[PDB]
Every structure is written in structure tokens, then in C-alpha cells.
């Protein structure tokens with residue numbers, strides 16, 4: 001079985017798992033919609049009461065399973081809870097990352113295609129001295145709409161450009177070239193290059209954005225809006241719903257990806273300090289880097305109220321239309337846009353390999369496929385299924401809700417219950433702390449066993465016909481994966 005080569009490479013690979021497209025596209029929108037600073041306090045609390053303990057739990061479950069040759073949750077749940085229903089629940093740890101990848105790699109290809117076009121200067125050229133922002137936003141809006149082929153009429157049909165489709169082919173090929181080299185020579189080797197690159201690009205963009213100023217505002221105004229606490233909105237449950245959901249999304253928790261990565265950590269190697277360092281690096285890249293780019297740039301040009309209204313228009317609109325349009329009003333702004341989309345591409349690529357590895361690990365561990373065949377069959381499934389996302393409008397929305405939103409939160413609660421309630425709280429705690437360079441504070445034993453599951457349960461309770469096409473297909477994917485698990489059990 002493969003193993004990570006270096007402790008640093010393991011850290012950077014896990015950091016790249018978490019630091020992805022959602023950290024930079026979705027997190028600023030969610031922070032701005034919920035009052036900025038009024039969102040950061042619950043998010044930080046959700047980082048301490050949900051993100052940190054669930055990260056340690058997934059690290060421990062992964063290393064525990066990998067010790068017996070199993071990297072995915074159908075087998076790992078059954079090891080922790082010897083029950084046929086544990087295998088059925090474990091299927092979600094393959095279905096969630098696969099379905100997410102079926103649209104995630106497509107969005108990743110957007111950022112690559114935009115990086116190419118912005119580097120060569122093939123971008124919309126708004127007329128100078130524009131006294132109206134719409135005359136600048138509209139060329140970039142039509143630019144994205146032509147790239148992905150937004151429907152012009154009532155038919156929910158997307159029409160991707162030829163360039164967008166070719167770039168999606170290249171993007172799949174790049175993911176395959178990394179994954180086919182394996183854990184150490186592929187994912188780990190790429191992480192050691194991509195994470196320093198990602199960090200340097202983000203720091204540069206933060207500095208450049210921080211210098212932005214118009215008569216409508218400054219970047220410091222946006223930072224003040226994002227970091228000034230508002231204790232009145234602590235009463236609102238919706239802020240906690242958004243904060244805990246963002247904790248799942250930014251940390252790649254509940255996607256089965258952390259577990260599979262941790263399955264290549266050796267039996268004796270640390271997971272406490274290593275996991276804490278990976279999660280801390282991700283939060284630095286999320287709240288400090290990602291949150292300090294697009295929202296402060298928007299506030300600098302539009303003011304807080306208009307920037308919030310812009311953020312309500314969605315992650316795609318802010319990331320692919322509004323931010324490049326704002327950049328186009330500055331010297332060297334086309335090159336600044338290229339850096340933004342190159343940052344997004346490396347963040348996406350380090351995350352998409354992470355959510356495609358669970359299916360690869362299942363085929364290797366349980367069906368005994370070679371790495372080459374496992375990676376190629378996984379890529380074929382993702383590439384084929386992605387045509388539903390590329391051509392059917394709102395198919396991505398349905399996949400992102402059922403697998404990317406409902407699925408990840410329920411799966412995080414499920415894995416915690418299996419590990420800390422069914423398998424055994426004391427046994428789980430000793431397995432988490434075994435071989436650690438530092439020990440988890442004893443207070444977290446009662447956070448994992450009582451506070452975290454009660455937190456998730458309470459918040460979950462407080463929480464067109466074409467949609468059935470996507471539902472019918474992802475339900476079929478689940479049935480397909482259940483059949484593969486069935487075939488594995490008949491061979492074992």
C-alpha cells in the first residue's frame with residue numbers, strides 16, 4: 001500500500017485538499033450575506049467546536065482503516081461497526097466525493113480557460129471613461145455567458161463553447177496525470193509545488209487589493225465590514241447554519257476525502273499535530289487570504305451596501321464577472337485577473353484530485369484494480385457524468401445541494417456517531433491520540449462525544465421538472481456504487 005513520503009508533503013497535500021475553489025468563491029459570498037464580522041465569530045466558534053474535532057476524527061478513521069488496507073468508508077464503517085447498514089452508509093463516502101467531482105472539475109476548467117484567455121489578453125475591453133458600472137460589468141457577464149453557454153430562452157439547455165469543452169478535456173487530463181502517479185509521486189509531489197505557488201499568489205492579490213480605493217470606498221472599508229463583530233446577529237440561527245456549513249465546505253469535511261488521504265498515513269505516524277497544522281493552514285488561506293480579496297475589492301469600488309448586494313448574486317458572478325471587471329479598471333488589471341484565475345485553478349486542482357482519490361482507493365483496495373485502471377475508470381465516470389452538468393442548466397445546483405450540502409453534513413454526523421458512539425468513545429479517543437507529537441486537550445473528548453453531535457443535530461433540525469433528470473442520475477450512481485460494494489463483498 002502507498003504511503004506519504006514526508007511529513008511536510010502530507011501537510012501540504014491535506015492543506016491542498018481543503019484550500020479549494022469554495023474557499024475563494026463561496027466563502028466570501030457567505031461571509032458578506034451574513035453581515036461580515038457577524039459571520040466570522042460563529043465561523044471561528046464552529047471551527048473550534050465542529051471543524052477541529054471532526055478533522056481529527058476523519059484523520060483517525062482514515063489511518064485506522066488504512067492499517068487494514070481500506071481507505072474508503074464502506075469498509076471503514078464496517079470495521080468500526082460490523083453491520084450491513086454500516087456498509088450501506090459507507091457508500092455515501094464514495095457517492096458524495098464522486099458526485100461533487102462531476103461538477104467541481106468543470107468549474108475548475110472554467111478557471112483554467114479564463115487564466116489562458118486573461119494571460120493572452122483575450123478579454124472584453126470596456127470603453128474608457130465609463131460613468132456607469134453596467135457598461136463595464138456587461139462585457140464580462142456576456143464573456144462568462146458565452147464561455148459556458150447560458151440559455152437565451154426558456155429551455156434549460158447549456159451550450160458550452162468549443163474552447164470551454166477543450167479546456168475541460170485538458171483539465172481532466174491534468175487531474176489524471178497527477179493521480180496516475182500515485183500518492184507520493186503524484187499528489188504529494190504536486191502539493192509541494194502548488195501550495196507555495198497558491199500562497200504566493202494569494203498574498204500578492206491581497207496586497208494589491210488592499211491598495212484599491214475609489215470615491216466609493218477602500219479595501220480597508222471591506223476589511224472593517226468583514227472583521228468588526230456584531231453581537232446582535234449571534235441570536236439569529238441562520239448565521240450559525242451558514243457558519244457551520246462553511247466549516248464543512250472550507251475544511252473538506254464529510255466528503256470522504258480527508259479519510260482517504262489519511263489512509264496512507266502509516267500506523268505509527270502522527271495525526272494530531274499534522275491534522276491541526278493542515279486545518280490551520282487552510283483557515284489562514286480561507287479567512288485571511290480568500291476573505292481579503294474579492295469582498296474588499298468590491299467594497300472599494302462600490303461601497304459596503306452595493307458589495308453585499310453584489311455578493312447575493314452568487315459565487316460565480318462575483319468570481320468570474322465582478323472581480324475581473326473591477327480589476328479591468330486598474331493598471332495591469334488584465335494580468336491581475338490572470339493571477340486570480342491561476343490561483344483558483346491551482347486551488348481547484350489540489351482539491352479535485354482529493355475528491356477523486358476516494359473512488360480510486362475503493363477500486364484499488366476492494367476490487368483490486370491497478371492504480372492505472374482505477375484512475376482511468378474513475379476519470380471516465382467523472383468525464384461522462386459531467387456532460388449532464390455541462391449541458392443541463394441547474395444540474396450543478398441539484399448535485400451541489402444533495403451531495404455537496406445535505407450529504408456532507410449528514411455524513412459528518414454519521415461518521416462521528418459510528419466512531420464515537422458505536423465503535424466506542426474511549427477506543428476512538430485513544431486511537432486519535434496514538435502516536436501524536438502532541439495530545440488532544442482532554443476537553444475535546446467531551447466536545448467530540450457530546451457537544452459536536454448535539455450541535456450538528458440541533459442546527460440540522462432548525463435548518464422545475466428537469467431537476468428529476470439530475471436526481472434520477474445521481475440516485476442511479478448510488479445504486480451503481482452499492483452494486484460495486486456488493487461485488488467486493490462477494491469477492492472477499
Ligand SMILES: CCCCCCCCO[C@@H]1O[C@H](CO)[C@@H](O)[C@H](O)[C@H]1O
Pocket residue numbers: 159160161162165387
Ligand atoms: C452521452 C451523450 C454524448 C454526447 C456527446 C457530447 C460531446 C460534446 O460535443 C461537443 O460539445 C461542444 C459544445 O459543448 C461543441 O463545441 C462540439 O462541437 C461538440 O462536438
Ligand SMILES: CC(C)C[C@H](N)C(=O)O
Pocket residue numbers: 017018019020021022023024100104249250251252255257351352354355
Ligand atoms: C474538496 C472540495 C469539495 C472542498 C474544498 N474545501 C474547497 O474549498 O473547494
Ligand code: NA
Pocket residue numbers: 015016017018019020021346347348349350351352
Ligand atoms: Na485545493
